[PDB]
Amino acid sequence: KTTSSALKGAIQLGITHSVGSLSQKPERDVLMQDFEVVESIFFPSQGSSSTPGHHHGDFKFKTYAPIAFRYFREMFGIRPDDYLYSLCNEPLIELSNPGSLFYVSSDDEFIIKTVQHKEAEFLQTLLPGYFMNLNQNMRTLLPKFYGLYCVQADGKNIRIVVMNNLLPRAVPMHLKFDLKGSTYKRRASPKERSKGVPTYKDLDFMQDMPEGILLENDHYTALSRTMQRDCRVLQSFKIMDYSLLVGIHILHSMGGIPAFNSKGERLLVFIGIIDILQSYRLVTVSVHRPSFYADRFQKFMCSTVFRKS
């Protein structure tokens, strides 16, 4: 009945039906064909035989690449009931991150961004490439996409993507940093510093934390190799301007990453590459630019931000 909560409900309604029915059909493998599908389903306010009930205001629900996401979800270990529950059965909490409404699952596991038709279309083209990545680099840092959907509310189209909340309220985040390996204007806006645990940027990290984050020689090795891979993918996709988001938690489930500190403390660190849906279509930056971006990015992360012994 609120302007936006109007939508929260289509979302909750829609995903419940969509995935609802999928779980009844039997599981098969995913074919190429599957990435290019869009299934649609009409929710009338009076309700139908399939799509019954309401009080939110007449909508159509579009689901993209259902089987692919089913499969991605599995690969990510997100059992359907948990998906459905966390998302459909527990009030969606809105958020104001600086057009583009963001949301969280009541349980903080799932961020839900809206996206512009461009990004959405783009991501649809990422799918197969994404599949090849998941099945080769099981520890990939990329976003975890659990679903892509669209809501037709009266006139226009709201496109949402559903994904992982890299740092959920559950573990208390002592530090948050957001990195690109560039420097310009790469400082926390005064507004942002006037916040609890703020998200700092590259220069901030470089003054505030010159010792950099130290790393057990094994762990280092891994991370390094994974980013080198993720960066290769990202690049191949003519993608840039994405950041390594890093969550440092000091200790003054244990599935983060063990690092020692600038001083001598123990820390459990959480990271993920984020903001990945911005690509330039060849079919204005130079050909070699993304490689440049990923090189710089990778080299930065593994030579400053993270180091060994």
Q: Which of residues 233-252 bind a copy of itself (CB under 8 A)?
A: 233, 236
Residue from 10, 11, 15, 30 in contact with a copy of itself (CB under 8 A): 30
Question: What kind and span of H or E run contains 9?
Answer: helix 5-24
28 interacts with a copy of itself by CB under 8 A: yes
What is the separation of C-alpha 140 from the centre of its chain, rounded to a whole number of angstroms?
12
Residue from 2, 3, 33, 286 in contact with a copy of itself (CB under 8 A): 33
229 interacts with a copy of itself by CB under 8 A: yes
- Annotated binding-site residue? 165: no
Residue from 62, 187, 219, 232 in contact with a copy of itself (CB under 8 A): 232
29 interacts with a copy of itself by CB under 8 A: yes
Question: What kind and span of H or E run contains 54?
Answer: none
Draw the binding track, 113-152, toward a copy of itself (x: CB under 8 A; -: no contact).
---------------xx-xxx-xxx---------------
Q: How far apart are CA 57 and CA 49, in angstroms?
A: 17
164 neighbors 82 (Cβ within 8 angstroms): no
Q: How far apart are CA 146 and CA 73, in angstroms?
A: 6
- Annotated binding-site residue? 166: yes
Given the rule CB under 8 A, which of 26-34, 52-60, 77-85, 207-215 is the region that contacts a copy of itself? 26-34
What is the separation of C-alpha 193 from the centre of its chain, rounded to a whole number of angstroms?
24
Any residues with CB less than 8 A from the CB of 137 and at least 6 apart, and which? 226, 229, 230
Q: How many residues bind a copy of itself (CB under 8 A)?
A: 18
283 interacts with a copy of itself by CB under 8 A: no
The DSSP annotation for 179-242 comes to E-S--TT-S--HHHHTSSS-EE-HHHHHHH-TT-EEE-HHHHHHHHHHHHHHHHHHHHTTB---
281 interacts with a copy of itself by CB under 8 A: no
Residues near a copy of itself (CB under 8 A) are: 28-33, 128-129, 131-133, 135-137, 229, 232-233, 236
Q: Which residues are annotated as a binding site for Ca(2+)?
A: 119, 275
